[PDB]
Structures are given as C-alpha cells and as structure tokens.
Amino acid sequence: NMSAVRETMDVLLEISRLLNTGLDMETLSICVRLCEQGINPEALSSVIKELRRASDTLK
Amino acid sequence: MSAVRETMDVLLEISRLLNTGLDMETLSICVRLCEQGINPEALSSVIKELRRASDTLKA
Amino acid sequence: MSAVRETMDVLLEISRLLNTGLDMETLSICVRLCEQGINPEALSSVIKELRR
Amino acid sequence: EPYVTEAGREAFDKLYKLHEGGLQILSATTLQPQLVLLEETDLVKAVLNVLIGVVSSTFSYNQALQSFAVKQGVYISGTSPDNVSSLLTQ
Amino acid sequence: DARSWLEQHIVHQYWTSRAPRFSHSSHLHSNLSAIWDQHLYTTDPLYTPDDKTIVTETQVIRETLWLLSGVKKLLIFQLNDGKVNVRNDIIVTHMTQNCLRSVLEQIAAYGQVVFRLQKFIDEFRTYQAFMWALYKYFISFKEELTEIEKCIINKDETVTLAIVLDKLAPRLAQLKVLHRVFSTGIAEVPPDTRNVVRASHLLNTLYKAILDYDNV
Amino acid sequence: PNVLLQNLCCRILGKGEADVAQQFQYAVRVIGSNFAPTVERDEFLVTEKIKKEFVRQRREADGALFSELHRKLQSQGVLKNRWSILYLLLSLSEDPRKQPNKTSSFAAL
Amino acid sequence: PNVLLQNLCCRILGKGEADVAQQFQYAVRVIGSNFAPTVERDEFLVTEKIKKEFVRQRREADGALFSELHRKLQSQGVLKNRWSILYLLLSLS
Amino acid sequence: QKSPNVLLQNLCCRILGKGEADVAQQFQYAVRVIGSNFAPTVERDEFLVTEKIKKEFVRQRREADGALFSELHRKLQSQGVLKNRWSILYLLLSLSED
Amino acid sequence: LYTLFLESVQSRLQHSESVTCQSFELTLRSCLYPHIGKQYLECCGNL
Amino acid sequence: ETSLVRDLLYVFQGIDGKFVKMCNSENCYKVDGKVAVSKSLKDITSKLSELGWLHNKIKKYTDQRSLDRAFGLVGQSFCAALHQELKEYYRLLSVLHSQLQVESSLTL
Amino acid sequence: MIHELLLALSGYPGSIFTWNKRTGLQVSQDIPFLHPGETSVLNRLCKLGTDYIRFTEFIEQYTGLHGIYLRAFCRGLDSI
Amino acid sequence: MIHELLLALSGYPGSIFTWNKRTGLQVSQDIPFLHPGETSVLNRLCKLGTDYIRFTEFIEQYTGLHGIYLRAFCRGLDSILQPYRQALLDLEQEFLADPHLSISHINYSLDQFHLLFPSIMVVVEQIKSQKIHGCQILETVYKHSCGGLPPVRSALEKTLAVCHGVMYKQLSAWM
C-alpha cells in the first residue's frame, strides 16, 4: 500500500514539474485527496489559485 | 381531467429520455407553475439549487 | 421480556440436567424469591419437605 | 415491512387518493370530487337492484335517455381506483 | 396524510434517497462495513470513500429472487442478454462491499442464464415443443418462487444469505445443466440452412445429454 | 402560487413540511429577482436545441423518438406553456458519460 | 414475599390456597429464623461444586454443557442473585 | 485525517508560512469559496482534457515537454489509483505556465 | 403412437425408483421399436 | 493487566498473540520488556506457559500425522485418538474467552 | 392491490392503470413508494387484459363486413 | 469477524480474505480491531477453506479427463460435503442465539472436519496428478479407505459406494 501511494505521487510529480509550478509535492498530494473527496474541478481550481495569489502578496 | 391523464404519459417519456430526474408528483407542480406564469430561468435555477442542497443535507 | 424468556429457558435446561424435579412454575417462584435475597439453604430445606 | 403489493388494500387506497390529488389540482370545478363512503359489500347490493331497474344511492335514473347514471367522480368505487366507475356502467 | 402512512408501512427507498435508510444494528459484528471502511480511510491516504446505497437487510435478496425466475430489476446494472452484471454501489449492513459483490456475481450468473432462457421464449413445431418443454419446466420453478416468497414476507422473517439460498440450491444446479445442452445445441441457427439441421442437431445435443447424465 | 411552490420544497427534499422553510423563503427571493430570458417562445427553436443536444450526447435513437413524442404531445392537447416546459427539461439534461464527482462527500466541507 | 412463599407451597403440593396452611406455618418459621444468607456471596464456589458433581458421577459431557449454559445465564445480564438459584438447583439434585 | 476541511487547513498553514490560527481568516475565506455552487464542466471524456494540456505545451513552444507528458499520461492511467483523474488534469491545466 | 409410448414408459417406471429399468432411456426406445413393428408388419399385410 | 488476560488465552491456544514470547519450544514465557511489571504475576504466566507449551507438542504430532496414508494403520489411528481429547481442550477454552468481553471475575 | 388487479385484468381503465390508446391499458410509469422493478412485470400482466378487450371488440362488432360465420367464430372463441 | 469468515469458509472471497485463485491464498490480516492472537488462529481456519475451494472446483469442472467414473465420483463426494455445509448454517443461528460467541467457537466446530479435509484433498490430487481414470479410481480410493483415521475410513466407503453402484449398472445390463 505504501508503494502504491508513492508510485502514484511520483508519476504526478514528473508531470507537475513539466507544466511548471512553484508548488511542492506535499500540497499536490493534498489536491489528489481533495479531488478524491469529490468536488467540482472549478471549485478546486479557484481555491488553489487563490492561495497562490495570497502567498505571493504576503511575501 | 381525462385530458390531464393523457398528457403526462408522453411528457414522462421526454423527461426520462433527456435525464431530468423528477418523479410524477413534482412533474405536476412545474406544469402548474408554468400555467400560472413563471419566468423559465427562475424555474430551472431553483430546481438545480434545491437538488444540489438536498443531496448534501442528506449525506 | 425477550431476555427473561431466554433466561427461564436456560434455567429450565440447567434444572433438567441436574435432574432436580422442578418444573417451570415452581422454578419461576423459586427464582422470584432468590432474587429478593432469600437464603437458598433454608429454601432448599422447605422445598424437600414440600416434595415429601 | 410490506410493499404495496403485499400490504393489502389500505396501502393501495392511500396511494390512489395521493395520485388522484396530483392530477386534481389542474382541473378547477366548484368543489373537487371526493369520496363518499360505501363499503364493498354495500356496492354489491346497489348493483343487485340496478339489474331489476331500481335506483340506490349511486344510481340516478334519467328519463331523458331512459337510462341510469352512476357517480362520475372519485366517489368511492370500491377499493379500485375509479375502475368500478366504468365497470358498473356496463 | 397519505404520504406519512406510505412512508411508515413500506420499506424506506433505495432507488431514490428521499426517504433515509436503516443503517444500524446493535451488535459490534454487524457494523463491520463502517469499521472496515474506516480502517481504509485511516490506512490509505488516496482513498475515495465510495458512495453506497444502503440496504435494509433481505430486500436485495428478494429482488435477486425476482430475477431468478422473472423480470429484470434496475438496482442491478444489467446491459444486454449475455451480460447481466451487478450494480456498483449496493451494500448490505454487515458485509464489505468487495465481499458482497463477489456473491452477487455468483447468483448474477445464475440469473444471467434465466434471462437468456427467457429470451428464447417467443409467442417448426419440434422447435416450438422444445421451447415449450423449457417453459412447462418453468411453472415448477415459479411454483418454488411462491414457496420462498411466503417465508420472507412473514414476520419474523428469519431468512438470510445462507439459509434462503439452500432451498433453491438443487434447482440452481438443474438450470446449470440446461445451459450446456442448449449452448452446444444451437450454433447453425444463425448461419444459413435451418431446414433439417436445426431440428436434428438440437435432438442430437438432447440425445447426448440424456446419455451423459442418466447413465452416470 | 404559494401552496404550489411550497409543495415543491417538501417533495424535493422528500421530507419536511416546515423544515423546508429556509428553502421556500429562498425560492421566493430568487423568483422575486427578475430574470429576463434569451428568446421567449417559438416551438421550433426550443425543439431544435433538444434535437442537437440529443445528437451531441450519443443518444441518437432517442433523439429520433423525441420527435415522434413531440408531435404526439400536441395531439393529446395543445400547450400554451410549452416553451417554458421544454426549457426546464433542457436545463436538467445530462450526459450518459461520467459522474459529477462526489456530492455525498462534499457536505463534510 | 408472603404471597410468593405461599404460592410455592400451593404449587408443589398441588393443593389450593387455604389447604396449605400447616406447611405455610412450617416454611414461614424456617424462613423466619434463617431469612437471609449466612455464607459469603460468591458465584464461583457453586459453579465449581456443580462441576465436581458431574466429575463425581462421570457425566463429564453434561458438565461441559453445564458450563456453556451457566455462561449463557450470566451473559444475558437479567439476574443478579445467580449463585442462590444455582445453589438451590444443586441442593435439589 | 482526510476530511475536506482538514485537508484545506494543511494547505493554508504551510503556504502562508505561519501557524494554524494565524491563517485562520484565509481559512474562513477558503471555505466560503468551496461552498459556492459550481456546475461540472467535465461530464465527458478523459481524452479531451489531455488534448488541451498537449495544446498548452505546443502554444508556449515546449514541444519536448508534450512528447514526455504523452508517455506519462499512459503510465498515470495504468496504475489507475486515481478515480478522478480528469479533475486533476483540469487543475494542472489552469496551473500551466512558462 | 405417442400415447402408447407414454403408457409403456409410465407402467415401467411405476412398477417408485427406476432401478428395475436399466439403462435406461434406450430400453424405453427398444419398447417403442415393437410399437413401430405392430404398425409396420400390419401395413405390409394389406399390401 | 487486562491485556495479559487476553494474552494467556492466546497462549492456551499455543499461538503467540499480543507480545513476543521468544519461546514456544522451551516454555512460552511472556516478555513485556519492562522492569516496572512485577514478577509475581509473570510467574503465574510461567505456569500458564507450560500448559500451552505441552499443547503445541500434541498439535505438532498431528501435523506429522498428515500423510497420503504412509506407514502405519495403527500409527495415524492413535493420533486420531489424541485429536479427540484435544477437541475437548478447546471446549474449556471457549467459556474462558467469553468471560473476557464486557456483557464472576476476570482475574488470573 | 388484490381486487384492484382483477379489475385491471378485465381490461377496464383504472386511475393507477391509465389507458392510452396508442398502447392499450398499461401501468403508468414510476409511481412513488413502489420500487420501479415490480412495475416491469406488472406491465406484462396488463398485456393479457389489453389483448382481452382487443378481443371483446372482435365479438361485439359482429354481435349485438358481414358473415354468419363471423358470429359463429364468436361462439368458437368464448370457450377459450 | 464472524459472518465474513462463515461465508469465506463456503468459498466466497473477502478483501480482508484475499484469494487469488488456484495459485495460492493470502490470509490478508492487517486488522486492528481483531487481535494479533485472534487473527493468528483465523489463518488456521483459513487453510481449511483453501482446501475447500480446491475441492469444489473439481466438482463443477467434471459435472456439467474422459470417464463416467470421474463424474460418478463427483456425485459420491458432494454427499460427504453435505454435513460440512449442513454445519455451516447451524453456526449461522449459533451467532444469533447469543452474540457472546467469537471465533473460539469456530475453532471448536471445525476440528471435527479438520481430520477429513487435507486427507481427502490429498486423495483426489493423487488421482489427478497421475491422471487416473476409469474403474481404477475406485481401486485408488479403496486402497485409501483400506487406510486409517476412523472418520475417513467410514467416509470413503460411502464415496466408494455411489460410483461402485455405477459399476453395478454396467454388469447388470451386460448380464
């Protein structure tokens, strides 16, 4: 089971780096779990984007 | 009243083919509402909001 | 009430196994007394005299 | 529990009253049609009379057609759902 | 009110969620699905908690008992005649969804055959009298349908997965042996020439079958 | 209108006859905001949207059937309220592929 | 108390309510002098005695069963003076 | 554990760079946003989304990245531990940059 | 000929358990082969 | 406390449960890995260890009993006879475990 | 259900059992507090009382083209 | 515990009871609530359902290589699994009569069948790894019922009896 989560995390992590993102894996791991808990792709996108807007302003 | 029975059998065919998901009793309420006059935009908008609301309340 | 029936069944079966000579009605009575904190010794003594 | 099929007559009756109501709203008349008690054994005696050509309290004889007239509403119709309202007319 | 009387005296809905749903029992062995599902929700950080239609003990089994000698049901996601397969969200209170499916797929296949056997019933005579021998045999399986239907409608009903499905257990095997004869019988019926060969090679799998089974 | 809109609030939730108060008052507010529509009437135009939609979801047969049903519908009785009825069914139209995510896990947020 | 005590005489003797008088006085006296238990309360001692008895008669199979049944009596949670009842049955074997 | 809210609190906390209660206000905001009614744009085809991402790479001249991604899609599907792939692909689509 | 067949099948089974018959259905065909004979010899008589 | 009480039931069955024993073949002695436990109730579970130790030797003769039907006719019919009295051992164990779950004492 | 299904079986219209002239008598689709599953078999039970009043109409037309054997075929079928 | 194991014993798989079909069985216990001691014995009862579904596969395959005494021994052997399966539903009510029973009850009832189940499964596997067919299956099981263990030697005389009965049919018509 430990291997399965990790292999999954890895295929996603190669793809994320390719489309470019400032995000770490750990937040990306949460996103998969949020999608898996259901939830319309537009709500998920908006909140992620918004967090990023809030981070950049803050620092 | 004879009239009222015939229309609903053909109407129920469209709604079930098209995916709508309204039982008999409710399908009668909308036909009443549309005959007494309603904006069509409002009627679709409520039905969609009540449905989304109902599923969350239950769960 | 359900539980009580099942309990009387166990008690009747135990009674049969121990071949005492008690039936259901006498045993229910015996149980109601014991539950009121009756001295079983004294009670056995009465019961043997009553069977004679 | 039971479903309607097993549940006797009453469950079916409650259902019939609910279903008819659903239709009854779009049709507007002075007073809506409602049930007026007869029992199933009282219906078989009102029909015993209509064979000889005598009125009961569901038949109104019409001289204009020289024929009898049953209640057209949701008048009790046994436990059938407005089926005796057409069957009893024959 | 007709609606509140109907909600109490008929089992809570499972095709619609409008009337919620029995999902409790008082032992600690009968809440198994919730614990097992929990264990997974603690154990796998990637778990989708499957959405599931709650039963409401021994009502999925009467609807498999319907299927087994009668019509299709829409709490079963069956497709075509050769595919009768299981809806992907049905659970019983005290079994794992994986575990339960595994059995629903056994008896799915024993209703797969009954739906196929029914599909041959349409409204030469040799071929009609063989179809009617299948159907004359059906009224003795529908004779059993009302036997097992009276045990489960009674209160206390005291039937379940393991003592309901033993009474029809010899008839379940008698319909399995209907299948091999008829599957190897017709095969020249869709390619050309019925004429002599439909009757003759369907007498032939019948004849092989009474030699295979009687004389052993 | 009040007895009708209300009965809708009870049925949709399938439960509650004053526990649906929140939803009623809400429905009333929504209806009380004045929407204006994009196209009002014409039987042919609404019927066409439903035909194109049919083709688009891969339910071509059904789309063929719907036309028979539409003509039938006029003959069992003529409607003055059809555009609105046919619209309502339109907005509630769905695709036979895919689910809308979970909405039974979405409550917990 | 009194009514139950009387009903017992009545039932075992199979004689009616006022036909049990002489025994009724004997039981009331015997009970009255030793009303309550004189020995510690301890369920365990009785279960061991009932099991030695079965051992003693080499009716070991009825003994094994008797343990299952005693466990069943306890698990139901209905009685409280279980010991006394079991001691009364044992005394009557 | 892995409830929608807990998973969101973890997001805020680490990204803003502060403790649990210092990000409490943006946590309140976030919940309001999620609970907004949003209607699915994807009710069809895992394929059509994969195609848009491929279009993004071509559009920015990142052709090599599209060549690798295509192979990587095939892997992503194959292990299949994700049952809501499509949603994830949309999220990644919106996060597409140079 | 069909009725005659059932009657000759019925009387062998009832005269229960089939264990007096052996083995089993071809024995029932080889009673039916004399049912054909009584019609086959008697048609050939009028010829 | 109560955890040693479930754990002696697993050693009467002779198959190590909650704790590691590091023994099954010179006694069965429980190891809690602490000095803070008394050795006055670990001496009791060394009498309960020797009932479970001598148990596994009757089970392992019956594991060498599984043959196609090689050597002896009397040789596996003897071990058959040792499987009957062994079944009864398991019957005195089924009343013990039922004492453990919340429904006299549960002490050692 | 019990007397109510005998009189849908005679072919005569009920409220629950709507008559639509296109199809004969059929049970109306998806009636609440009855699972949809039991109505499919019920539609088939209506199909023997639909064809039975498609049958009395073949009687009554020629009783109470032309042909003295038409009404003789009516007295052939009545014993069925 | 109890109802998933009662029906994995009839040979219907769990996922907390992994069975991957005819190459092996993994016991699949990573279960918190079941104790490491009560699950360890649960594997001992699981081995006896592994050999139970390696036996029913041989039923359904040869009733439905060539030989009338392969399938005549198949209608002999189901009669011996008839009290096995009989015991499976009497246990169903054992857990309804009181809910104060656990898997210690399942260890106690299943030792009577434990002296039947590898010992007959090795008999049919020895028939089938030599590929023995005909009248000499009956000689093979006869030289096994010449063997020991007092339950098995009575059981295999019953399994010998239904397909010796099929022998008896040939030489009754042949004579």
Side-chain angles (χ1 to χ4, degrees), chain F residues 56-58 94-95 97-102 105-106 108-109, chain H residues 4-5 8 31 34-35 40 42-46 84 86-87:
Chain F
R56 290 193 72 229
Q57 305 330 306
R58 291 67 57 89
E94 321 184 64
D95 317 344
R97 301 171 174 65
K98 303 215 173 167
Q99 297 318 306
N101 309 299
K102 292 170 192 308
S105 289
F106 182 47
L109 189 284
Chain H
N5 295 270
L8 189 56
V31 168
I34 295 158
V42 181
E43 278 179 60
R44 60 201 293 209
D45 305 328
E46 303 198 306
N84 289 101
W86 57 108
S87 198

Side-chain angles (χ1 to χ4, degrees), chain C residues 3-4 6-7 10-11 13-15 17-22 25-27 29-51, chain G residues 1 4-5 7-9 11-13 23 26-27 31 34-39 50 54 59 62 66 69 72-73 76 78-81 83-85 87-89 91-93:
Chain C
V4 176
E6 293 166 16
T7 286
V10 169
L11 276 176
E13 204 169 292
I14 285 179
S15 193
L17 293 193
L18 282 166
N19 317 248
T20 58
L22 293 186
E25 320 184 276
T26 313
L27 172 60
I29 306 175
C30 294
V31 169
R32 293 160 172 170
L33 298 174
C34 294
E35 293 292 271
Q36 291 181 29
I38 290 278
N39 181 6
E41 292 184 0
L43 195 43
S44 42
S45 183
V46 161
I47 283 164
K48 286 179 198 155
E49 181 57 31
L50 297 168
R51 294 176 180 161
Chain G
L4 307 192
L5 181 58
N7 293 0
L8 204 60
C9 291
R11 285 272 66 165
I12 292 166
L13 293 199
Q23 278 297 135
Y26 173 87
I31 286 281
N34 277 321
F35 173 100
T38 43
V39 180
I50 290 162
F54 293 130
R59 302 172 60 202
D62 276 24
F66 158 78
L69 298 179
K72 180 177 170 179
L73 189 83
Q76 302 182 39
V78 173
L79 309 173
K80 288 189 181 58
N81 299 351
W83 87 277
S84 288
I85 301 166
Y87 191 117
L88 161 149
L89 287 167
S91 293
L92 294 174
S93 65

Side-chain angles (χ1 to χ4, degrees), chain E residues 62-131:
Chain E
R62 204 198 37 219
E63 292 185 266
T64 301
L65 297 166
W66 229 278
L67 190 52
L68 253 271
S69 307
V71 284
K72 44 189 179 70
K73 314 299 281 286
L74 298 182
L75 197 75
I76 290 192
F77 279 160
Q78 43 136 67
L79 310 180
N80 49 267
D81 185 27
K83 310 187 71 63
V84 165
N85 59 286
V86 190
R87 181 152 174 152
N88 312 93
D89 54 8
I90 314 306
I91 64 152
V92 170
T93 25
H94 49 115
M95 292 184 77
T96 297
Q97 189 169 268
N98 301 307
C99 186
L100 181 53
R101 189 183 185 63
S102 300
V103 168
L104 287 189
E105 298 172 306
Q106 300 292 120
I107 201 43
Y110 284 122
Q112 202 188 116
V113 57
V114 167
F115 184 60
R116 197 187 289 101
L117 286 164
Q118 237 175 295
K119 192 49 56 182
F120 182 29
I121 308 302
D122 59 349
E123 282 46 64
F124 203 87
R125 317 186 308 210
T126 282
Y127 189 60
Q128 302 289 97
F130 164 70
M131 188 170 82

Side-chain angles (χ1 to χ4, degrees), chain H residues 5-95:
Chain H
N5 295 270
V6 181
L7 294 167
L8 189 56
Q9 236 302 115
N10 284 2
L11 298 168
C12 309
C13 177
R14 300 176 294 118
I15 70 114
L16 296 170
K18 292 187 296 168
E20 293 174 91
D22 294 9
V23 296
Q25 295 56 240
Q26 294 316 300
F27 178 83
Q28 294 328 112
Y29 176 62
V31 168
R32 288 190 77 147
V33 172
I34 295 158
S36 310
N37 199 20
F38 283 107
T41 50
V42 181
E43 278 179 60
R44 60 201 293 209
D45 305 328
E46 303 198 306
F47 311 95
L48 190 47
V49 209
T50 294
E51 284 295 283
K52 285 287 191 160
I53 299 154
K54 179 56 158 155
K55 298 283 195 183
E56 293 295 342
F57 284 129
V58 164
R59 281 182 282 207
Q60 309 196 306
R61 286 64 63 173
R62 295 186 298 157
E63 311 296 306
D65 297 341
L68 301 168
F69 169 56
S70 302
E71 295 174 80
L72 285 156
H73 182 40
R74 311 319 315 197
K75 278 74 182 175
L76 186 63
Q77 291 176 278
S78 188
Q79 315 312 277
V81 185
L82 300 190
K83 304 288 200 52
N84 289 101
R85 302 160 208 161
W86 57 108
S87 198
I88 298 167
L89 264 68
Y90 188 100
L91 173 58
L92 290 164
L93 179 67
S94 44
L95 289 172

Side-chain angles (χ1 to χ4, degrees), chain L residues 139-150:
Chain L
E139 124 72 35
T140 292
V141 76
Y142 182 53
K143 287 308 167 172
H144 286 121
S145 67
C146 190
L149 316 168

